[PDB]
Write a protein that binds this ligand. Structure first.
Ligand code: NA
Ligand code: NA
Ligand code: NA
Length: 327
DNA sequence: CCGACGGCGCATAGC
DNA sequence: GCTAATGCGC
DNA sequence: GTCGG
């Protein structure tokens, strides 16, 4: 595919997607359009007919019709209607602020808060996460070029070991799959001292150190097992300050670690095939454990997992190195 | 025809 | 003050 | 909005 073959169609379906998510608050109609929008992108021909697309899975009748209209006219009536009604547009803008969902945004626009300008006028009417989201509105929409992730992975891995020798940490997401760009940094942490049958100072002490290295600037949310905040790579006094980046850090028990690493490395399509393969061979996978399925469809106690490779060794698959996990 | 569609950690009215 | 429901992001 | 029981 080329992101250029059917760009018009996928842009449209993605426009309709966020409209259902952010304005109409129909989150299943949002996923439907994305599903639709994402399988069209992977089609290696310029679509010529609505029906030609309906063949694909997740493109149904109404999406074919709007594709017919789009190729026939070059715009969507519905989409132009939406584009100019200004409630919809403003609600749509505001939900780009992290911490502003469809509910807050709708309420803001209700009382006439519709621009970033308006939001900083009223930073009192904003909770903490939203203020942070407002402060970094630009930086958060930016891509993180792989080469940055590398040097970031460096600071978090190196300084986590300056804390406890037995912590093990793994950046995941697209970055562990070899992707040239990442949207944020997702870290996965564990410690031998942390079981299912389980210190609550475990995730804190890493964030505490990572805050001394002047790496982590701001905290969106922090608890015993999930942290969500903002890091920034260091500028070498040469007047080019790196953009602030979104980082999460999960603390997971080691007996569920590599299931955590395997899930949160994905990819998404990859997982439903690995599950469904695993399901079709006596076992069942989730983020936490791999369990055997009896003749009844009833699952047993979770199997031991010491390496990510152990998962494939149960289900009789051969280890995929992450680079090849895009489906 | 018609329900499912992901489920869960953290921050933030009702009693 | 305590509990559970909800928005939000992932 | 689309899929499938
Ligand atoms: Na179809
Ligand atoms: Na948002
Ligand atoms: Na958003």
């Amino acid at each position: 595919p080329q992101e250029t073959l059917n760009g018009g169609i996928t842009d449209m379906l993605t426009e309709l997607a966020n409209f259902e998510k952010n304005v109409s608050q129909a989150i299943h109609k949002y996923n439907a359009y994305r599903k639709a929008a994402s399988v069209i992108a992977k089609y290696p021909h310029k679509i010529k007919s609505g029906a030609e697309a309906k063949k694909l899975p997740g493109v149904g009748t109404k999406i074919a019709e709007k594709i017919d209209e789009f190729l026939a006219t070059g715009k969507l009536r519905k989409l132009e209607k939406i584009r100019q009604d200004d409630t919809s547009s403003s609600i749509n803008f505001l939900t780009r602020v992290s911490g502003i969902g469809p509910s807050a945004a709708r309420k803001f626009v209700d009382e006439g808060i519709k621009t970033l300008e308006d939001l900083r006028k009223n930073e009192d009417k904003l909770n903490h996460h939203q203020r942070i989201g407002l402060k970094y509105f630009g930086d958060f929409e930016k891509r993180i070029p792989r080469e940055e992730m590398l040097q970031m992975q460096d600071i978090v891995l190196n300084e986590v070991k300056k804390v406890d020798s037995e912590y093990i940490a793994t950046v995941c997401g697209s970055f562990r799959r070899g992707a040239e760009s990442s949207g944020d940094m997702d870290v996965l942490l564990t410690h031998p001292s942390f079981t299912s049958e389980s210190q609550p100072k475990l995730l804190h002490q890493v964030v505490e150190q990572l805050q001394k290295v002047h790496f982590i600037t701001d905290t969106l949310s922090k608890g015993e097992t999930k942290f969500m905040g903002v890091c920034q790579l260091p500028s070498k006094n040469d007047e080019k300050e790196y953009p602030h980046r979104r980082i999460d850090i999960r603390l997971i028990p080691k007996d569920q670690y590599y299931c955590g690493v395997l899930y949160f490395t994905g990819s998404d399509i990859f997982n439903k095939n690995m599950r469904a393969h695993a399901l079709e061979k006596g076992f069942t996978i989730n983020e936490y454990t791999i369990r055997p399925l009896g003749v009844t469809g009833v699952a047993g106690e979770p199997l031991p997992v010491d390496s990510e490779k152990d998962i494939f060794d149960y289900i009789q698959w051969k280890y995929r190195e992450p680079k090849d996990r895009s489906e």
